[PDB]
């Protein structure tokens with residue numbers, strides 16, 4: 001099916017998923033000098049105190065740390081968001097080299113990786129229904145640069161050996177996602193889509209200005225994962241990012257000056 005190779009990559013997705021050339025596709029390049037400061041935006045509220053992580057899965061495209069979203073245990077509110085959005089999972093997109101890997105770019109600059117904390121609007125009952133709504137999801141994006149290690153990410157790095165191939169999963173309870181956040185919550189926001197098929201245009205993107213630093217050794221372990229399943233020829237899971245798409249008729253708002 002779809003992937004990140006030369007024959008099934010982003011350039012090919014539009015054939016099976018025509019929405020790939022849609023009105024509000026993601027990611028996009030964030031031109032910092034074109035974004036408009038919006039004084040009406042309310043403070044962003046990240047409430048992850050009662051977060052309940054459950055499992056980590058290699059789905060052949062990336063790895064997901066899944067949470068229990070049967071109640072409002074971990075939610076995102078405020079900012080450009082109306083209502084409550086529950087955290088369902090988080091994952092990353094990364095490159096084969098430190099100079100590439102992120103999906104969104106800042107003034108054309110590419111980061112080593114990008115973290116996506118996915119949340120769904122509770123007004124819609126379940127994730128499946130939410131992806132069919134223009135304001136169904138809220139994804140918090142965090143850029144990762146290479147430098148000093150991120151203590152809060154090590155627990156994720158150390159379990160990757162147990163889910164090397166597609167389809168593999170492992171118990172991953174008691175993980176605190178608050179350990180992956182930077183100091184500042186300053187952000188940029190715009191209406192977009194999922195960055196992978198089905199590419200549904202149901203996302204309110206909130207991208208933080210401040211990146212987090214991770215060590216070369218931590219990102220190197222991300223690159224040892226496989227796109228393939230067990231017993232199959234090895235294809236390293238690297239460069240699983242979609243490039244920037246046309247902004248078209250959209251405006252990016254900033255929470256800061």
Ligand SMILES: NS(=O)(=O)c1ccc(CCNC(=O)Cc2ccc(O)c(Cl)c2)cc1
Pocket residue numbers: 116118127128129131139193194195196197198
């Ligand atoms: N890179 S990104 O923009 O943050 C991002 C985030 C999340 C997704 C997963 C979307 N999955 C489905 O749509 C399948 C589904 C369909 C019905 C369901 O009930 C359930 Cl649970 C799942 C893709 C990309």
Ligand SMILES: [Zn+2]
Pocket residue numbers: 091092093116195
């Ligand atoms: Zn993503």
